[PDB]
Symmetry: C3
Subunit: 196 residues, 3 copies
Amino acid sequence: IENNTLWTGAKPSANCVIKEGEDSPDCKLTLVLVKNGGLINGYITLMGASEYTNTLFKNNQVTIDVNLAFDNTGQIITYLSSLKSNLNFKDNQNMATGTITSAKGFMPSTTAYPFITYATETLNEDYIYGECYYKSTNGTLFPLKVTVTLNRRMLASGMAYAMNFSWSLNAEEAPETTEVTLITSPFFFSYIREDD
Amino acid sequence: IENNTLWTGAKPSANCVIKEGEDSPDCKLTLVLVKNGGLINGYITLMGASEYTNTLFKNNQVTIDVNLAFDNTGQIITYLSSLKSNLNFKDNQNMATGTITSAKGFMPSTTAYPFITYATETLNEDYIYGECYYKSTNGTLFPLKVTVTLNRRMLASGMAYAMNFSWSLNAEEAPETTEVTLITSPFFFSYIREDD
Amino acid sequence: IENNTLWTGAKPSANCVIKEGEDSPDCKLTLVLVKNGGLINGYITLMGASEYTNTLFKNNQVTIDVNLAFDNTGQIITYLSSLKSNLNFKDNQNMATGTITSAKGFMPSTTAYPFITYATETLNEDYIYGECYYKSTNGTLFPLKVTVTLNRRMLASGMAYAMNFSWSLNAEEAPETTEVTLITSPFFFSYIREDD
């Protein structure tokens, strides 16, 4: 058990909900958070697991969202998050088993990335922009604009941290025509971490 | 305290100077350097804190430079740098208090990234090119080409290492029309580190 | 000596072959792999060391390939790879001396990035896409599309892992006219790692 890593395990089963209103997993979310000094080194990827997700790319303009809300101990609050199974430590290629006593040290810092406090506050320092890709059936690479939001809005009283990801597909013509497994290539990023 | 992290602290006060021939801080520079094996994982963000900086983006072609000069012990030499206060180790969300006995290990390898020795010498292995973004008032994302110069040019007799950053804006038209806090989205990078 | 880092050493001597069917190192390959929790933080750069490699960019369309095959203990399989000299632990700015008794812990996870089990199998999760740059003589920058293939294709019985890199240039017109040193700017990446 390596406690310097908070993740979904390598190659996880459907554990994430991307469809609006849905409650049951419709895709596989791979997320790796690693404590690296004052930073967290992150790794994230999405793999479709339903006709809905695997059809999304028959359109030329799509936006996928995965929202993550954590309590005061860095535990995922499922009813508020797209991810339906809590993260855990590294135990080889899987998620360690048992209760985690605080993963606070893995959360985005509230000093560096604050929560909105007043009506018109923009807080643009709470955003990370980047890019990853989708490889279509014929082999073409479609660029996906990625936006990461750290602690900008709280959604309920027991919520202490937030981490949102969104992938944006805005191309000339749809990538696919058939139902093809939705795969976002590895997105890398880092952020100032909260103290333990 | 965590000595594998050399940083400006999370959310620092104005501490950097971007305007020509100035002495007083006109912007907030966040720089995190973490020791990770033979590498340094870096994070850097800029937040303007003056009328001159928060107005730079009323133009479409802007280049911002933040130059860092260090002594033989990896300490900042303020009169040679844009950053006007030495970096220090991590102590929760702050810069540690106390004297630093060498931070040489956080510096750019001179073996990998050499200093210029002759006149027409280019040493292109000293550059790291990447990209980050500025989000305007109306929500549009402007790309900023980031250049990182490792060592290469030496300025004074006491200077042992250098690290220069430059954000380059080259848009169709001016992102802004008003004075808006300049904000560069997190840029990530890595480099071969100097031995301890 | 630091065994949490596996590399070619900083600024190494010609150690890589980019030419078809060749066996004599015609370029310098800088590759650093650091164990960072469940991930491996990577850094990679190339430098021409022959007329062949330093002439390539006299064309507008070029693709450089660096293939890496490893055995069940993370050791390079030279007859199968482009890197003709094994990697080793960190010893200051050099490769440690001696025999690495297993570098499996630095290998691409077979669970996260599986090998093909049949004919028409795609395994698109085995790719990482990104970008680095080339600074020409006139100072202009040319974007190079980078593609990393993790495992996926097995080539011989003694193979257990793969890590191929490919730089792709596709610009209006050739970056050069003269034989100039080939230098790709640092490409950063992470991947889920194989258990020790």
